[PDB]
Design a binder for these strands. Structure first.
Ligand SMILES: [K+]
Ligand SMILES: [K+]
Ligand SMILES: [K+]
Ligand SMILES: [K+]
Ligand SMILES: [K+]
Ligand SMILES: [K+]
Ligand SMILES: [K+]
Ligand SMILES: [K+]
Ligand SMILES: [K+]
Ligand SMILES: [K+]
Ligand SMILES: [Mg+2]
Ligand SMILES: [Mg+2]
Ligand SMILES: [Mg+2]
Ligand SMILES: [Mg+2]
Ligand SMILES: [Mg+2]
Ligand SMILES: [Mg+2]
Ligand SMILES: [Mg+2]
Ligand SMILES: [Mg+2]
Ligand SMILES: [Mg+2]
Ligand SMILES: [Mg+2]
Ligand SMILES: [Mg+2]
Ligand SMILES: [Mg+2]
Ligand SMILES: [Mg+2]
Ligand SMILES: [Mg+2]
Ligand SMILES: [Mg+2]
Ligand SMILES: [Mg+2]
Ligand SMILES: [Mg+2]
Ligand SMILES: [Mg+2]
Ligand SMILES: [Mg+2]
Ligand SMILES: [Mg+2]
Ligand SMILES: [Mg+2]
Ligand SMILES: [Mg+2]
Ligand SMILES: [Mg+2]
Ligand SMILES: [Mg+2]
Ligand SMILES: [Mg+2]
Ligand SMILES: [Mg+2]
Ligand SMILES: [Mg+2]
Ligand SMILES: [Mg+2]
Ligand SMILES: [Mg+2]
Ligand SMILES: [Mg+2]
Ligand SMILES: [Mg+2]
Ligand SMILES: [Mg+2]
Ligand SMILES: [Mg+2]
Ligand SMILES: [Mg+2]
Ligand SMILES: [Mg+2]
Ligand SMILES: [Mg+2]
Ligand SMILES: [Mg+2]
Ligand SMILES: [Mg+2]
Ligand SMILES: [Mg+2]
Ligand SMILES: [Mg+2]
Ligand SMILES: [Mg+2]
Ligand SMILES: [Mg+2]
Ligand SMILES: [Mg+2]
Ligand SMILES: [Mg+2]
Ligand SMILES: [Mg+2]
Ligand SMILES: [Mg+2]
Ligand SMILES: [Mg+2]
Ligand SMILES: [Mg+2]
Ligand SMILES: [Mg+2]
Ligand SMILES: [Mg+2]
Ligand SMILES: [Mg+2]
Ligand SMILES: [Mg+2]
Ligand SMILES: [Mg+2]
Ligand SMILES: [Mg+2]
Ligand SMILES: [Mg+2]
Ligand SMILES: [Mg+2]
Ligand SMILES: [Mg+2]
Ligand SMILES: [Mg+2]
Ligand SMILES: [Mg+2]
Ligand SMILES: [Mg+2]
Ligand SMILES: [Mg+2]
Ligand SMILES: [Mg+2]
Ligand SMILES: [Mg+2]
Ligand SMILES: [Mg+2]
Ligand SMILES: [Mg+2]
Ligand SMILES: [Mg+2]
Ligand SMILES: [Mg+2]
Ligand SMILES: [Mg+2]
Ligand SMILES: [Mg+2]
Ligand SMILES: [Mg+2]
Ligand SMILES: [Mg+2]
Ligand SMILES: [Mg+2]
Ligand SMILES: [Mg+2]
Ligand SMILES: [Mg+2]
Ligand SMILES: [Zn+2]
Lengths: 114, 50, 59
RNA sequence: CUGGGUCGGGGUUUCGUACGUAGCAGAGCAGCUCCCUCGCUGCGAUCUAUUGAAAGUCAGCCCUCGACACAAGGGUUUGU
RNA sequence: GCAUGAAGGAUGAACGAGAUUCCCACUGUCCCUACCUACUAUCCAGCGAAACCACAGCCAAGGGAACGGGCUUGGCGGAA
RNA sequence: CCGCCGCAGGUGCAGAUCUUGGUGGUAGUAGCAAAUAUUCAAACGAGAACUUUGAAGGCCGAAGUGGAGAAGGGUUCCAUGUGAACAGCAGUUGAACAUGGGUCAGUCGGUCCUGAGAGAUGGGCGAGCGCCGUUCCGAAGGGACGGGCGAUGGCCUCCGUUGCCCUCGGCCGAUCGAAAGGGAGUCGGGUUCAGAUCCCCGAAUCCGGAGCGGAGAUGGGCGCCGCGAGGCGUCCAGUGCGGUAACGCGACCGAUCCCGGAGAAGCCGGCGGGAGCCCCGGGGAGAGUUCUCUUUUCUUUGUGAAGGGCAGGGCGCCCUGGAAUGGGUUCGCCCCGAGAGAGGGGCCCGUGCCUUGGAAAGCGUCGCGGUUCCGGCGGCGUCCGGUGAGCUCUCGCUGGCCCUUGAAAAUCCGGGGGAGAGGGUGUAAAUCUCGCGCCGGGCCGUACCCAUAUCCGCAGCAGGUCUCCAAGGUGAACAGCCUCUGGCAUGUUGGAACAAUGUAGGUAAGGGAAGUCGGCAAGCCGGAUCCGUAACUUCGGGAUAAGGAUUGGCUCUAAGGGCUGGGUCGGUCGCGGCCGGCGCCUAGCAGCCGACUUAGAACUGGUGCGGACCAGGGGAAUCCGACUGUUUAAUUAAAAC
RNA sequence: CAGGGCGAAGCCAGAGGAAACUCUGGUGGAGGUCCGUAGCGGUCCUGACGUGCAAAUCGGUCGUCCGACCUGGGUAUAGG
RNA sequence: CGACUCUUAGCGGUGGAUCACUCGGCUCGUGCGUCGAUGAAGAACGCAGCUAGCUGCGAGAAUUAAUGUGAAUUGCAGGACACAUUGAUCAUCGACACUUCGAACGCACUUGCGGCCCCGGGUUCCUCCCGGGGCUACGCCUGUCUGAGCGUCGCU
């Protein structure tokens, strides 16, 4: 078998010194230095363990050259919060304001008594 | 080491340029007593210390 | 060329350009172990290095 | 007209029966069977014969000049 | 109980390159020593140190700072 | 240079384990003995045990005597020349000497960021150099947007610019601190005596700055003319659209301000996916063997980044629906009315495969040229399958462990909000994270050694010194032993001999610890399979307790799997195509393919068989310390800590 | 930071039981767990060496080898 | 008979004493008694035709100018307008020049990273890029400007 060598002066198997084997058009196996695995955004809800969908999982600086569509979902809080928790916050906001009007008018009516 | 600062490299440059024998025509000059370079450094014998 | 250690690639390109009235495509510099700066000055494709070397006196 | 060297040969002795060839010896298995049939062929450790065979044996074993060369030299000294 | 004894006394299974005693097995540990191998030592070519050193280097007795290579009286003494 | 008369003194050596320098006997002595090993021929040369070339025999044996680095060295690198010295024998050789040459970057690092920490200022202290302190006793903002005021004439066209003012701004702490942490983006082929992801060729890309498209966006209403189509007027829209949804599409306005994410993280187990490697069955091309036999044995048999498609993997994502006779499901789990299964779909990864790159290049082989020191020119080939608890890397999934919870910051991004901005139907406008085009990327490092000879140890010192890659056989195995690739010449000498005494290894009749302080040393045992295992016990152990049997070769037998095929009465063209009481038992069957393991049996050998290698002697007690851990580097490993 | 041994909890199935629960087989993979590499260390031969390879090394044999583990670099502590 | 050994002499070596020499010290005395933000002391690197050290010097680099002097310098070479009298050389030194670090000064100490102003170039007409020049340290004095204070007051 043809043994390999590093192609850079970093000789230690660190996190930045990660390589994949590749076969060149020249009939030889070489190291190619891989980029670090990206991670999709965690939901801003802070409760759902899974990461968001519809967003590319790249390293942070890569996001600067991606188009807007590849980074966000076409929805309110899209690409920042999961759809499930957006549904909950929509009805939570609606219901609580409904209770506030319920309490306010109930308190408005609670003036005939003592 | 292959990794070196500019100051250390420039220091090593001067030490290589100085480590040469005397020109043979120095000896012919009047009142000459220098018969051989007494400040010759060999890389393996005496170290620079830097 | 052997050039001053102070000079950078922009200065080397500018110096060679109107010293010898030629155009320069690329400059690659190194500092050799004796402390000198050696510049590899690649001329534009239309200019011929052998022709320029004759006018300089290199050969 | 001899010698003692090498090789060869014989003796001695050590180990234990060589390669190859052959075998209706071989536990079994696989193919080809109708041609006879239970035949024939292939694989197969091992066994038997050839075969007390093969191999080694003075280098500090014994007897041999069978063969082949070699030997009448070389150097340093020594006297009452 | 020279002079044991309680946060240390007393005990423990498991563990220990910890100290000790016995038994089996095992052996050159020994009776009792032999032989073999490698690398030295040995000889040669080349190369080539150091410690140490008053002067040196054969004994017996004697006396002497009471254990002498030297002194005394004997024994003796032969290159390298 | 000296005598004599006086003067003056650093004025006389045998010693001081005196000081410095020199020199002997020892002595051509000790020694040039750690790590298996050299031999033949030729060349060059004055000269060969040692250089070079070829041949042979060996070793390292992928945890290397191999290939590359970090630190350190600093020219040792490479070529040529020399042979004084040096390389403890030699030398035609060298890491020696002499002369000349050699390190090429936007995308490999530094540079930037913070870490532990270091450290200014304000302040305090201090005789004082200074010290403490790092948000604390500070008026610690020097920036930006919109608007307003005045000038500017630069491109007086009208926006840049300038000063002021208003508005808002915690910089909640300067700065330094990593060539292994964080950190955008370069790969394939060729080239040198020595350089290379840096040069050349080709193909990309990131970041920074300021043209052409495309998007925004050209819709509708009502009248009129016209066969109609189309146009005209006039008014109203228009910061894109699609999907039930998860979310999708090439863009798809937006500030101060706020929220979030990424960067951003432990160790261990199990399993799965993807490579690379190894193995296998075939086809080629070349090579080896050919006494005999072997369709044999060996070698070789590519497609980079980036883009596009796709396979594959993953998903606590979504729609339908509503589950007990509970069901699904893993090696293990685990999941479910807070929605299982089942059906349809969405997203992420995509290192694999195909394509652009791309065969033109590389490589193999057979030829033909030459400028014979050409990136020479041709021909042909670079093929088809299988297998896996294999090994390494990678990616996932899912657990376990913790009185242990396993960085920060630079930097980038999404969202919430809606102050604004844009033009009135156009030759539209603000605007644009879509496509293409244009320009730029400065500075420093880059040679080589990286070690039984380039580093440290006074040296080419058996010591020390941080890493990556890792083949075949045997086997549990990066064990040991042998081999291939690659490397080397036995570790600063060679020849002859084979005495004693050694150092290292081994064997020994009979006895068996009688030796000795003491079984010190050596020896015995040893793997695996099947049996069998005591006292005691903190019930976990003791335990491989103890003790016993077996083990080779050959020929068989049995067992342990995967995939495919459900064919239904064809009357019959959109004797292939799809409809026709239907066949619809037991595919429980037939074909094919494949891997490795276990058990049993026969035969067989001079009873040999874990045949080398690898590889626990055991038991009965006593003392101490519970255990594991630590320790006197260089005399103590312990009962000591 | 090879490869193996032992086999904790949890889980599955079967059997027994009035129940409490029990028994059997499997799965699972815990531990400052065991054998034993690399690494780290340094027991004994009171072995080699002892003007050494070495101002502490070498050989065999050893201790440990998933942890109170081994290790590079950065950083902190400075002479009573 | 030799070796070998010892003694003594001759000669040869090995070694560097002795003597002679001295551009060096030591001691005493005298006159003077002067460094630096206009960048010192010290350090680094560089500079010669051949030159490594010492010395000298700073990119104008083993020296420029000037003055004095009056034909050399020299190890070799080269130049008759670089072999010079129109001034070689040496000395003096008042003119000019004077790299980097250094109290060391934009910040940091990596030739690491800025900011402001001016000039030239990129057809610059903006942004931006390159080159060049000037400036950008702490403390403190006087003065100026801009301000702060529910510090003390005056007017409205
Ligand atoms: K036979
Ligand atoms: K026979
Ligand atoms: K112990
Ligand atoms: K290195
Ligand atoms: K770094
Ligand atoms: K760890
Ligand atoms: K391809
Ligand atoms: K005994
Ligand atoms: K212990
Ligand atoms: K003059
Ligand atoms: Mg490299
Ligand atoms: Mg999206
Ligand atoms: Mg050294
Ligand atoms: Mg460079
Ligand atoms: Mg006869
Ligand atoms: Mg008492
Ligand atoms: Mg007591
Ligand atoms: Mg107690
Ligand atoms: Mg006597
Ligand atoms: Mg006596
Ligand atoms: Mg005496
Ligand atoms: Mg007397
Ligand atoms: Mg005197
Ligand atoms: Mg005296
Ligand atoms: Mg004397
Ligand atoms: Mg005396
Ligand atoms: Mg000798
Ligand atoms: Mg010897
Ligand atoms: Mg070996
Ligand atoms: Mg081997
Ligand atoms: Mg091994
Ligand atoms: Mg020699
Ligand atoms: Mg070399
Ligand atoms: Mg040299
Ligand atoms: Mg940079
Ligand atoms: Mg401080
Ligand atoms: Mg920094
Ligand atoms: Mg890093
Ligand atoms: Mg190289
Ligand atoms: Mg761990
Ligand atoms: Mg590929
Ligand atoms: Mg690709
Ligand atoms: Mg081709
Ligand atoms: Mg895997
Ligand atoms: Mg919005
Ligand atoms: Mg290199
Ligand atoms: Mg060594
Ligand atoms: Mg070593
Ligand atoms: Mg030293
Ligand atoms: Mg391996
Ligand atoms: Mg092995
Ligand atoms: Mg040897
Ligand atoms: Mg040798
Ligand atoms: Mg050696
Ligand atoms: Mg025997
Ligand atoms: Mg015996
Ligand atoms: Mg016996
Ligand atoms: Mg016995
Ligand atoms: Mg006894
Ligand atoms: Mg006895
Ligand atoms: Mg023992
Ligand atoms: Mg026991
Ligand atoms: Mg056995
Ligand atoms: Mg006892
Ligand atoms: Mg203990
Ligand atoms: Mg332990
Ligand atoms: Mg000790
Ligand atoms: Mg111990
Ligand atoms: Mg010890
Ligand atoms: Mg203790
Ligand atoms: Mg393994
Ligand atoms: Mg079990
Ligand atoms: Mg353990
Ligand atoms: Mg253990
Ligand atoms: Mg060890
Ligand atoms: Mg000893
Ligand atoms: Mg000895
Ligand atoms: Mg460490
Ligand atoms: Mg550490
Ligand atoms: Mg002290
Ligand atoms: Mg004499
Ligand atoms: Mg002499
Ligand atoms: Mg002058
Ligand atoms: Mg730095
Ligand atoms: Zn959520």
């Amino acid at each position: 078998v043809q043994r390999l060598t590093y192609r850079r002066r970093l000789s230690y198997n660190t996190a930045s010194n990660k390589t994949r084997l590749s076969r060149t058009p020249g009939n030889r196996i070489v190291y190619l230095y891989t980029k670090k695995v990206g991670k999709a955004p965690k939901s801003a809800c802070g409760v759902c363990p899974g990461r968001l969908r519809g967003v590319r999982a790249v390293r942070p600086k890569v996001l600067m050259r991606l188009s807007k569509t590849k980074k966000h979902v076409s929805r309110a809080y899209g690409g920042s919060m999961c759809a499930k928790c957006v549904r909950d916050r929509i009805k939570r906001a609606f219901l609580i304001e409904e209770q506030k009007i319920v309490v306010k008018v109930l308190k408005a009516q609670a003036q005939s008594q003592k | 080491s292959s990794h070196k600062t500019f100051r250390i490299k420039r220091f090593l440059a001067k030490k290589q340029k100085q480590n040469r024998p005397i020109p043979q025509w120095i000896r012919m000059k009047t009142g000459n007593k220098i018969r051989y370079n007494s400040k010759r450094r060999h890389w393996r014998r005496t170290k620079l210390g830097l | 060329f052997i050039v001053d250690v102070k000079a950078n690639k922009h200065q080397i390109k500018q110096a060679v350009k109107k010293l010898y009235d030629i155009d320069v495509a690329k400059v690659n510099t190194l500092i050799r172990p004796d402390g000198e700066k050696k510049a590899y000055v690649r001329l534009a494709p239309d200019y011929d290095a052998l022709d320029v070397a004759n006018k300089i006196g290199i050969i």
